[PDB]
Ligand binder design. Structure first.
Ligand code: NI
Ligand code: NI
Ligand code: NI
Ligand code: NI
Lengths: 229, 234, 230, 225
């Protein structure tokens, strides 16, 4: 119940922080099974009852609905990364600009540091590959990283929890927006010092900050009343 | 008739939601079951306010055959596209923000990302801007330049999409506008883009244009326009 | 009817994203000589109601309505005196038109919707700081000449219409034209202008009273809220 | 009244699009060595008057319910260095952070940028509370604002209304500069004498307070016609 509620909030947060590209969004949580948003729904309409548990053959083991067959590749990532418990893939507007231009992230600001030495870049675009080819390609290119920019496609985040995968997704999208806006006006950016970036990376990825931020974004999706007159 | 008008009303709300307003420049039509006629949004209304009763059926002379209202005379040229393209049943024309950047800069789309592929080998580019021609000349110019494509970027003007259904014309419109936004933002920061392989782009084009995906995506966007309740508070 | 039209013009300007603190100005020439209708000081365009528009004279005395005029609108009298054809003036520091003003870049007519400003947008290259009405009015009236709009370097823009509907339509079209030009030049460099003869025909077509008034009425309905489809 | 003013300042910052839990706001307390601030874990968009607490130099809550955001402790060094400052805002707002990330100072080229003319410091070093406070107080000097390289910005006002006004004007000035440079390259600055006159005009209390009250009314919702 807690997992489905967390996944529903993660979906609403991703929709609120403007990540939508038709029905291209995917989310999963490790259960050889995984929890995922049922087929045909967007992140903005997800409720706890829309998350189903499914095996390697995409058979539903718990809940009502069918899995989005495009999430089958997530099993290869979970198999390669025992530390990963949640995966998010979207074609969000600004991260997809970096993907389309074949441009890796350049760590030049405090909030970009959760991706410092933690964002892989897959240069090859295999088109619409089958689940197995995509899983092997993405697991290999991801390596031990928390995120990957997929050239000509979008991005994927891989977190130890659904809260961490969501936090990485939002921070990667905002980091991409900052980099694209800054390079359009001023050209290539000078990165910050690697040692200080690694310290800021560890600071921003502490569970207390990740969970408090996820809970804040969750409250924002529910609506906040203006101050009374 | 009722289902056609309801589909057109949702298409208008979806275009408005996906931010495509430039005054009353927006046009939408659906080929009528009656020869020589088309359904279209009545004059004076924006896409964001369209309801089923705002779609009227008009003839080649712009006489209203069915419904209450007068046609936007600027939609008369659509008849030439329908005549040239028996496969086309719905047309959308707008001056949306990002697609109009490409049109203004005389820059064709460069297919460099998965969601740009429904326009791969499917977007014509009219390089000449003819000013404000009368519907007949506008119709011949646009039908000839469109050829067999699903979309066209009209230099110094905007774009047009031509679908087998109103759902397909809307899907092409949204994907073209988002593809143009991605390209403009990418080129402003990084310069010209590297196009993806043509064969893989054509496969992704065919995958994304399957009727099941087009209709499910149109229905999803239709639900979005109606408002989605937030998750409840405890 | 004048106060209602001005209230809708204000809501339209706020909706179409022109906001910059309380820097906005709007006026309509009064039927009474030497007077003009304007939004009262301290209110933004987004909160304007018909009762917030007052009629004021050259000395900023309130002739009709409740409230005090924004003294920064005094120079509008100089434009009305120089242009008998002008009945409504709008000045704001809208986001995109102000990028052109800040960069000292005139509009380049390269798309259909930019044509209402073709041969109709002056450019004041000098920024006089915070001048008094006497100086600002002469500077702006002289630079505007017979045009419908002017980009004011390092400041913003002003539109001058035969009606409040036309001043509003010019304001929205200028802001969107500036957005299109800035976005296009950032990605692709300087633009190719369209043919002058065709641009003048498109200018006349888009400035016809029927399309100006239908568009103003459409934007008016949008500010009031539209219910989603059931 | 202080907590209500801070609640409106928070809603205005959220409305004028500044969100990155990175946001900080404080007001110097009437009690020496203390400051009022938004409690930990809340964003500016949800702040109510009861969410502002009074805290001491050791981050102990003196008044109200809640714990302070420990990252606000450095505000004490700015208050100690600047007796004229009574409110401080720090955010990583979208456009001001573009300038900070690119190490680009503001170039005063338009009327609404003038409240920052000769009033915006630039800290070039990114150090990754005692060290942060000394570094930021020294770099800020006597200015109303500072762009912090690779980080964000801070404003320091004589009132919460002035800190909020400086925040909004700096973010909009950064947006204007970034959009203009992307399309047209480096900007020509306006005349310094005229910029200083416009700076003084726009920072008059009547304009600052009327503008803050206008933005406060906007956060509450305005009925359509
Ligand atoms: Ni994908
Ligand atoms: Ni058109
Ligand atoms: Ni002004
Ligand atoms: Ni910070």
């Amino acid at each position: 119940r807690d997992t489905r509620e967390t996944m529903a909030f993660a979906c609403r947060i991703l929709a609120m922080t403007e990540q939508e590209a038709g029905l291209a969004g995917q989310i999963s949580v490790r259960s050889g099974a995984y929890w995922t948003l049922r087929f045909g729904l967007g992140f903005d309409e997800a409720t706890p009852e829309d998350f189903i548990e499914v095996d390697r053959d995409l058979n539903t083991l718990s809940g009502e609905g069918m899995a989005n067959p495009a999430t089958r590749f997530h099993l290869w990532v979970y198999e390669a990364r025992p530390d990963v418990n949640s995966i998010i893939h979207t074609h969000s507007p600004w991260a997809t600009v970096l993907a389309t231009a074949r441009q890796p992230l350049v760590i030049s600001q405090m909030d970009m540091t959760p991706l410092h030495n933690d964002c892989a870049f897959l240069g090859e675009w295999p088109g619409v590959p089958i689940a197995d080819q995509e899983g092997v390609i993405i697991s290999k290119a991801l390596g031990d990283k928390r995120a990957i920019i997929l050239a000509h496609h979008g991005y994927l985040t891989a977190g130890k929890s659904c809260q961490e995968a969501t936090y990485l997704s939002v921070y990667l999208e905002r980091a991409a927006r900052l980099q694209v806006r800054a390079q359009a006006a001023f050209g290539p950016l000078t990165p910050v010092d690697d040692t200080l970036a690694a310290e800021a990376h560890d600071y921003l990825l502490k569970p207390s900050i990740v969970n408090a931020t996820f809970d804040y974004w969750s409250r924002q999706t529910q609506g906040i009343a203006p101050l009374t007159k």
